[PDB]
Structure formats: structure tokens, C-alpha cells
Write a protein that binds this ligand. Structure first.
Ligand SMILES: Cc1cc(/C=C/C#N)cc(C)c1Oc1nc(NC2CCN(Cc3ccc(S(N)(=O)=O)cc3)CC2)nc2ccsc12
Ligand SMILES: [Mg+2]
Lengths: 556, 412
């Protein structure tokens, strides 16, 4: 007998105030009972479970299923109730690595740890809560009652406790062998290095020697999978990676469910296939919960889909990470609030690609969106590679400088260089800081009756120019914007505009270049056409000349 | 200190479960070295999967220090930790601190590591050193001693701190010492060279009782509500008078008796913005009477310790930032301005982060608590970058302003 260290038990508790489960066992057929007795008799020999007396008051129902070709019954213990009553754990497997963050390991070995799993003991004080009952034949004897000594499959804590138990066992080995990487996937343990096949095989044997200390045997996985490893939806090749095959289906009838699976594939593919776009295909899902609803594709969604088929026509791949090279991120504007990007170290050899969609909002501009994309990529790059990339941005240095020096919010983007890739991001208008000498002064105002929704908008100027337009189905805020629009339409290339609308000032001072309001868009188009615009604000109803004059014109 | 002070969360509240945000490789490495040493010294221990709690952690560099430093963001835990009256019903925040000529800030958080934390409460201090690219499970620790940045620490340690200082305070009755979190604030009215000596002698007294050698020098002589000032001009354009009337109308929400009738009268008609308008005698008097009103303090402004303090900040350009601290709108308790922020002439976000820290420091000195900030910045930009420039062991609360306030002009 070679002494073997015990695996440290994790203490487990029920949620505060809650007791164990007390679910009734279902009646089973004679055949299922016979099967369960055989299975459990074997499990009991292997130490997994133990018989218990009638004092234990808890119970979880057990079942008997089977596979079609597999000529055996399968035992199933439904721990759904016990899981509801079990404490929360640290679930240390939520996130999976991204392939673009991985580094090349020429040599990779796969070990099966399905048997080490059962070496992880269940906290003795918690075992009572896992009791289950095999109903007896003809229910003429007491049912055979068992409890678990090992982490049950299907119990809430098994994944976190197993993974944490393996990690702690592997730590000294990983620490003292810095030239090897370890990842466990289901009951597969994957051990890679960049050593020669000889030195690599030696590390494996050393790892096996190490794992024997806890009595863990670990042979090689059954039917060693040749490359590429099919892992978490990817294809991991020795020198390249890509997503698994992206195939767009052909259809003349698209339902609300068909469009969701297409966005899913497209999104998944966007991490390597550059230039994927899903706006026009996402717009067809704005608000719906029935999935068979056949929503016709707009000529914009068709064009988008076909643009994706062209990109998806040929397989593309990313490379793995070289820490000795720079990390570079390049962004393009695609339109309609859509942005793409590529992250690479060598030109044309992308580590990964991605996209960024504009946030929902009534107004926005291209510089704010580009800034937001930069922040997303920054955070993604820190996750994957632990560093911020150098950015190549389709915005001139002088444009950025003008933007951040004048914009009312603090803003920042990390080290970046201009890349001349149209369409370039630009500032479409800039308001004056001071009133313009020699430019006509338009005093604008608008008003609307709350009940009738009738209103007026117009202006008076220092040259005696005047206009009032009557409006229907409008609001104070809308007439106030309309008045500014009229002044822009009716003035020359330079114009001073005086408004009393805090609402209108707040919109324009936010420097939108596009709006969900057609009226704001029209105002944007006018500003773009001007040489100089000074927009001044005054308080309403104070007797300010010009403003007082137009106020009475538009208030009935 | 063998005996631990029993600590509980608030009724019907679980421990914190805050996500660890991603960290660069160099910050992870710094944290691994720091925490390994903390673990060898018994200050923290590895924890198992049965602990589901988490508080975020990052790495910084104190003001003028090349050494990496660990900072735990205990904001969630602190609001979930019971309210404390450890020794008394409370320590009255010293109103004399804000009056001293000079005030020095001493980092004494290292003292906390000598007091053990209640064994039952330790699980709530859990934190994770994240891996890169999820390539390994994070390193999971919990505290065994009073952690820096935790609300409970100064309260539990207060009995010991008061005794450490009594001999010093006994001989310097005119020096005001106040503790907020991990910091002592030591103020005096005496010669800056003499004050620095007293501070210096306060430090070596700490060494004998069992530090850090760093300091911070403030001058709360000069913290007030800056007056509202109006232009003094020999010729006024239409635009000038429109700006004046708008500013005066804003001030009339704050000050009673502000009048604009005679100034508005000047703008009778529909005039070019650049036309020069001569002031009448009526308007001159009204302006003069407004100026007089603006010299006095705002009526009925009082601090209420039961309400939050609110701090607003405006970017004024060219490295200048104005700010106001208040509890109710138009009842400013303090206002100020900042220029040429240190080492950030090209970085808006660094400047804003430094303004936030300076304003929080003023708030601690005046009222003994931190304000809730209204920040002129988009959430995603702020949350990506602020930790890169943070140098303080506390962290305030903040919210984001997305609509440009018209009042930025009035504080120009
Ligand atoms: C080691 C490992 C394997 C897998 C596979 C699962 C499946 N199914 C997943 C992860 C996350 C792994 O974990 C890490 N993997 C790497 N790098 C990789 C190593 C593998 N290659 C691909 C490859 C190489 C050689 C052969 S070959 N010719 O030997 O058959 C086949 C495939 C890409 C880089 N780095 C780290 C760092 C910390 S964990 C970890
Ligand atoms: Mg009006």
C-alpha cells in the first residue's frame, strides 16, 4: 500500500433557514428497480455511495432511463430540489479563454480525469442531504436508501468544487513547471508546452507521478482527437484558430426565430470574419416575442445578408498571440451607427476581429461613437491580452484635438495614430464663441397650444426681416426647434441666432451629427451649409428686445 | 489584540458579490507579489469555492511613489456593513480642522494590519486577483486582519488609535488631529517650517508605538463660496447685456432682490448683437444694486449631516475646472476652481480624476464625509480609465451628466 494524500474537503452548508429536501420517490417498474439495484450495488463497492438507516429524514427522487443502442439502463437522481436549497458557490469557470489570447504550444497531451473526479469526497456533514430511495419490489420491503460520499453529478456544488480541487492539486506542478499550460474541459485535462516531443512526454509522466500522490490515475483520452480541437465552438489548430463552420441557410420564408439564429451565427463569426454587420437584420426584431412570425426582409436586410454571404464565402483564420510584438487595433466606420475593427500584430494577420453598434439614442455623432468603440476594444484587449492596443483611427489628429478641447465633457482616447481609410470621421459644424460682426441677427421663437396642438414658429431680425409660420400637431419644444430651422433657412452664410429655448440649446450644444428627429436632422443639414453660426440664449418673458417682439408674434 | 470585535452585516443583507474588472498584466503581477507577501505575514489567506463573495481590487501608485500599491474597492461592503458606534455615540467631526492654516495628511492604514478581524466576518472581505484571458482561475483571498478601506477598520481600531496619540495630543493641545478611514489629518496654525517639525515629531511618535513617510499639505484657510461676479465695462454690446441678464436671472434663483427690468429696457427693439448700447442711469443703479446683493452670503445655508453632499464639476477648458458642493439646489456650501492640473495637460480624464480626489479631500476635511459626484463625462469613458489615475485609499460615489448644463457659463 502506497499512502496517498486525501483531497481536502470543502465545507458545504444549506442556505440560511432552509432545510434539506424531502421529495417523494416515484413508483418504478420492476425492471427499473432491478436495474437501479445493480447500478447502486456497483457504486457502493466503489465508495461513491453508502446505505443508510431510516433515521435520515431527507430524500431526492431517483429515476431509470436508457439509451436506444446502449443496451443498459441509466440511473438519474433529480437534485433540482436540493440545488434550490444549497448555498451559492464561487463558479470559477464562467469565462473561457479567447483563442486570440492563447500562445503557441507545439506539444499538447490530453488526459482523462473522469476517474479522478470520484476521488473528491463530499463534506461528511452534507452527505445526509443527498439521500435517495430505490423503491422495493412490490413495495413489500423498506426501500433501499443511500447517500453520496462523492460529488454527485447534477448537484449544485459539483462543478465548482471539482474544478477548485483539481486546481489546488495542480498548483505546485504548474508553479514549478512554468513552461507548460494546463486546461481542463469536461473530464479532459489538456497539457501543452512548446518543448520538444521528448521533453514534453517527460513533463507528462512527471505530472502523472505528481497526480498519483492523491491516488489519481490519468490515462490518455479515448480516441485521441486529431486537430483541430473542437472546443467551445472554435477550431484550434497548432498555428491558427477559427470559429467552427459558419454556413448561412438559404430561405424564401424567414421567421422571427430564423432571424435570431442568423444574428447569433453572424455575431459569433464577427470575431474573425471582418466586416460582419447585423443592424438591418437586427432591426427586424425590434420588439417581438412570437418566433414563428414571418417578417419579410427589407431590401436593406437582404443587401446586408448578401454582404455577409460574400464575407462568409471563404474561411478565414486568426493567429495566436506573440508577446514580443506590438498589439494594434484598427477601426472602420461602416455606416448607420456600425463600426468594425481588427486587432493584429503583423499586417494582414488578425488575432481577432469585432464590431461595435451605436447605442440607442435620440442624438449622437461619429466622434462619440468612435470614442465608445475605442473604450470597448480597450476593455476587450485588457481581458484577452492584459494590455491596451495601439489604435489606428480614421480621424485626423487635428479633428480630434478640436473636438476634445472644445467639447463640454471630459473625453480621452489612448495612444493612437491616424489611418487614411475613408470614410473619415469629421466634425460637421462648429458654433462660434463670439457674435459675428456684420452678420444679421435673427431673434427666434415658437409656441404651441397644449390642447389644440396648434402652434407658431418664426423670427425677427435687426434688418426688419420677419417670418411667422402657423403649425399643426406640434409642441412647444418642436416649435422652438422649427423657429431655429427657419432662421437657418432664411439667413446668409453667417448668422447670429438668439433663442430662449433651453431645450433647443441643450440639443445643439451636444453637437449631434444625426438624430432620430427629422427636424433636428434638417437643422443639422443647415448648420453644415453655413460658414459661421453664433447661437445665443436668453431667458424668456423678461422683456429682452427682439425676443419680446417675436414671442408675442408666435403666442397667438 | 487577541480578542476580535464582533461584526455583522445589516439586517437581511448578504455579503458583496461585485465583479472583478479586468486588469493589465503589470497590475496583476504587482498584486501577486503584494498578496504573496501579505499571505506570508498572515494578513490574508486563500479561500475555497464555498465563499461566493467578492470585492474588486486593483493596483495604483501613491502620490510621488514608484511602488505598486493594492487598493480594494470596498464601496459595496461598506454600505452593507453595520453602522458603527464602536466606542461612543459618534465622534463630533472637528469643525476646527477646516480653520487651521495648514493641514497634513498622514497614511496610517498600515496600523490596521496588527488587529485581527472577526473570524465570522472574514468571508465577506473576499477578493480575486484575476487571470489574463481567463487562462487560469483567479487567486482567491480573504482578510484575516482589519483591511484598509473598510468602514469597520477605523471604528474598531479607534480605541487603540486614541491611546497612541494621547501623549502627543497632551503636549500639543492646539494641534487638531482627525482620522478619516486610513488617513490622519493634522492641522495647525504655526509657521509652515514649525508645523512640518510638529508633523515630523508626530511621525516618530507613531514609530515608537509601532508610518510610511508620506504626507499631504493643505491650506483650508481659503475654502468658501466664491462670489458671483459681474462684468465691469465701459461699453456694453447687445450680446453683453443679454449675457448679463441671463446670469442675473440665474442668480435670482439664489439671491432675493435681483432685478433685471432696467437692464432689459436697454434692449428695447431688435438690435444687432454687436451693437454698443449705452447704459442709462436706471440700468447703472440696478446693476449697482445687484452687485451689492451679490456681495453678501446666500441666505439660510446650513449643513445637514443626515443628507448627502453633492458635488458638481464643469470642464471650463485650458485645464480649468469649476465645482460646487451642495445638499439642496442653489444652497451652495462651497464652490471652487482648479487650474493647470498636475501632469495631465493633454488628458481630460486624468484632470477630472484629480479634481474628484481634491474635492473629496476638501469634503472630508470640512464635513467628515465624501460627496456624491455629478461628472461631466460618459460612463463608459470614465469607468474605463479612472482607476489609472486614482491615488487615494477611499473612493466616493458618482453619477454621469449627459446633457450640457447651461450653468457652466455662469461659473465661467
Ligand atoms: C492546452 C489547452 C488545450 C485546449 C483544447 C481543448 C479542446 N478540445 C484548450 C485550452 C484553453 C488550452 O489551454 C491553453 N492553451 C494555450 N495554447 C494553445 C495550445 C493549443 N494550440 C492548439 C493546438 C496545438 C498543437 C496541437 S498538436 N500538433 O500537438 O496536435 C493541437 C492544437 C493553440 C495554443 N495556452 C494556454 C495558456 C494558459 S492555458 C492555455
Ligand atoms: Mg416665447
Amino acid at each position: 500500500m502506497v499512502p496517498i494524500s486525501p483531497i481536502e474537503t470543502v465545507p458545504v452548508k444549506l442556505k440560511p433557514g432552509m432545510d434539506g429536501p424531502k421529495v417523494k420517490q416515484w413508483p418504478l417498474t420492476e425492471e427499473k428497480i432491478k436495474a437501479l439495484v445493480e447500478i447502486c450495488t456497483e457504486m457502493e463497492k466503489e465508495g461513491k455511495i453508502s446505505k443508510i438507516g431510516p433515521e435520515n429524514p431527507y430524500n431526492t427522487p431517483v429515476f431509470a432511463i436508457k439509451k436506444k443502442d446502449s443496451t443498459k439502463w441509466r440511473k438519474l437522481v433529480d437534485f433540482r430540489e436540493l440545488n434550490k436549497r444549497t448555498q451559492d458557490f464561487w463558479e470559477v469557470q464562467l469565462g473561457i479563454p479567447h483563442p486570440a489570447g492563447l500562445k503557441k504550444n507545439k506539444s499538447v497531451t490530453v488526459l482523462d480525469v473522469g476517474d479522478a473526479y470520484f476521488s473528491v469526497p463530499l463534506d461528511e456533514d452534507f452527505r445526509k442531504y443527498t439521500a435517495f430511495t430505490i423503491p422495493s419490489i412490490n413495495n413489500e420491503t423498506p426501500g433501499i436508501r443511500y447517500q453520496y460520499n462523492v460529488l454527485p453529478q447534477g448537484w449544485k456544488g459539483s462543478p465548482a468544487i471539482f474544478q477548485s480541487s483539481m486546481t489546488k492539486i495542480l498548483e505546485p506542478f504548474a508553479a514549478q513547471n512554468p513552461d507548460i499550460v494546463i486546461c481542463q474541459y469536461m473530464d479532459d485535462l489538456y497539457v501543452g508546452s512548446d518543448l520538444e516531443i521528448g521533453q514534453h512526454r517527460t513533463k507528462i509522466e512527471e505530472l502523472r507521478q505528481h497526480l498519483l500522490r492523491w491516488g489519481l490515475t490519468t490515462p490518455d483520452k479515448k480516441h485521441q482527437k486529431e486537430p483541430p480541437f473542437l472546443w467551445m465552438g472554435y477550431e484550434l489548430h497548432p498555428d491558427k484558430w477559427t470559429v467552427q463552420p459558419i454556413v448561412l441557410p438559404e430561405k424564401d420564408s424567414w421567421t422571427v426565430n430564423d432571424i435570431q439564429k442568423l444574428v447569433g451565427k453572424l455575431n459569433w463569426a464577427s470575431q474573425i470574419y471582418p466586416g460582419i454587420k447585423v443592424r438591418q437584420l437586427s432591426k427586424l426584431l425590434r420588439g417581438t416575442k412570437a418566433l414563428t412570425e414571418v417578417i419579410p426582409l427589407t431590401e436593406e436586410a437582404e443587401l446586408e445578408l448578401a454582404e455577409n454571404r460574400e464575407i462568409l464565402k471563404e474561411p478565414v483564420h486568426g493567429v495566436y498571440y506573440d508577446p514580443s510584438k506590438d498589439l494594434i487595433a484598427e477601426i472602420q466606420k461602416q455606416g448607420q451607427g456600425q463600426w468594425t475593427y481588427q486587432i493584429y500584430q503583423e499586417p494582414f494577420k488578425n488575432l481577432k476581429t469585432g464590431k461595435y453598434a451605436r447605442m440607442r439614442g435620440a442624438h449622437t455623432n461619429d466622434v462619440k461613437q468612435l470614442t465608445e468603440a475605442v473604450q470597448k476594444i480597450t476593455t476587450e484587449s485588457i481581458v484577452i491580452w492584459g494590455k491596451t492596443p495601439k489604435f489606428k483611427l480614421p480621424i485626423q489628429k487635428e479633428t480630434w484635438e478640436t473636438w476634445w478641447t472644445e467639447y463640454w465633457q471630459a473625453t480621452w482616447i489612448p495612444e493612437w495614430e491616424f489611418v487614411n481609410t475613408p470614410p473619415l470621421v469629421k466634425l460637421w459644424y462648429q458654433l462660434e464663441k463670439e457674435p459675428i460682426v456684420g452678420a444679421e441677427t435673427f431673434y427666434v421663437d415658437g409656441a404651441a397650444n397644449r390642447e389644440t396642438k396648434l402652434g407658431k414658429a418664426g423670427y425677427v431680425t435687426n434688418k426688419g426681416r420677419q417670418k411667422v409660420v402657423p403649425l399643426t400637431n406640434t409642441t412647444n419644444q418642436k416649435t422652438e426647434l422649427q423657429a431655429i430651422y427657419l432662421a437657418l433657412q432664411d439667413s446668409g452664410l453667417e448668422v447670429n441666432i438668439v433663442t430662449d429655448s433651453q431645450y433647443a440649446l441643450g440639443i445643439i450644444q451636444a453637437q449631434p451629427d444625426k438624430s432620430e428627429s427629422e427636424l433636428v436632422n434638417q437643422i443639422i443639414e443647415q448648420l453644415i451649409k453655413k460658414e459661421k453660426v453664433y447661437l445665443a440664449w436668453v431667458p424668456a418673458h423678461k422683456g429682452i428686445g427682439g425676443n419680446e417682439q417675436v414671442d408675442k408674434l408666435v403666442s397667438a | 489584540p487577541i480578542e476580535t470585535v464582533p461584526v455583522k452585516l445589516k439586517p437581511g443583507m448578504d455579503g458583496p458579490k461585485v465583479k472583478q474588472w479586468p486588469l493589465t498584466e503589470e497590475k496583476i503581477k504587482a498584486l501577486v507579489e503584494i498578496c504573496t507577501e501579505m499571505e506570508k505575514e498572515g494578513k490574508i489567506s486563500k479561500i475555497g469555492p464555498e465563499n461566493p463573495y467578492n470585492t474588486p481590487v486593483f493596483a495604483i501608485k501613491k502620490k510621488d511613489s514608484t511602488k505598486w500599491r493594492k487598493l480594494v474597492d470596498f464601496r459595496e461592503l461598506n454600505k452593507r456593513t453595520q453602522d458603527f458606534w464602536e466606542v461612543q455615540l459618534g465622534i463630533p467631526h472637528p469643525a476646527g480642522l477646516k480653520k487651521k492654516k495648514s493641514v497634513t495628511v498622514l497614511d496610517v492604514g498600515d496600523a490596521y494590519f496588527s488587529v485581527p478581524l472577526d473570524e465570522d466576518f472574514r468571508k465577506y472581505t473576499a477578493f480575486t486577483i484575476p487571470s489574463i484571458n481567463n487562462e487560469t482561475p483567479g487567486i482567491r483571498y480573504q482578510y484575516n486582519v482589519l483591511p484598509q478601506g473598510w468602514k469597520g477598520s477605523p471604528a474598531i481600531f479607534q480605541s487603540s488609535m486614541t491611546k497612541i496619540l494621547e501623549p502627543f495630543k497632551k503636549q500639543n493641545p492646539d494641534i487638531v488631529i482627525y482620522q478619516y478611514m486610513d488617513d490622519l489629518y493634522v492641522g495647525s496654525d504655526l509657521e509652515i517650517g514649525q508645523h512640518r517639525t510638529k508633523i515630523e515629531e508626530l511621525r516618530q511618535h507613531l514609530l515608537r508605538w509601532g508610518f510610511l513617510w508620506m504626507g499631504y499639505e493643505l491650506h483650508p484657510d481659503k475654502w468658501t463660496v466664491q462670489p458671483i461676479v459681474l462684468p465691469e465695462k465701459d461699453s456694453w454690446t447687445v450680446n453683453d447685456i443679454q449675457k448679463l441678464v441671463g446670469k442675473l436671472n440665474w442668480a435670482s434663483q439664489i439671491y432675493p432682490g435681483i432685478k433685471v427690468r432696467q437692464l432689459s429696457k436697454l434692449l428695447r427693439g431688435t438690435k444687432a448683437l454687436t451693437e454698443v448700447i449705452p447704459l442709462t442711469e436706471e440700468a447703472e443703479l440696478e446693476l449697482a444694486e445687484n452687485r451689492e446683493i451679490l456681495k453678501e452670503p446666500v441666505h439660510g445655508v446650513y449643513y445637514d449631516p443626515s443628507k448627502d453632499l453633492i458635488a458638481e464639476i464643469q470642464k471650463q477648458g485650458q485645464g480649468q475646472w469649476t465645482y460646487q458642493i451642495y445638499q439642496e439646489p442653489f444652497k451652495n456650501l462651497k464652490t471652487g476652481k482648479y487650474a493647470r492640473m498636475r501632469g495631465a495637460h493633454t488628458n481630460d480624464v486624468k484632470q477630472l480624476t484629480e479634481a474628484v480626489q481634491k474635492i473629496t479631500t476638501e469634503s472630508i476635511v470640512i464635513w467628515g464625509k465624501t460627496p456624491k459626484f455629478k461628472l461631466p463625462i460618459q460612463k463608459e469613458t470614465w469607468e474605463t480609465w479612472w482607476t489609472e489615475y486614482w491615488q487615494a485609499t477611499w473612493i466616493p460615489e458618482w453619477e454621469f451628466v449627459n446633457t450640457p448644463p447651461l450653468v457652466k457659463l455662469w461659473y465661467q
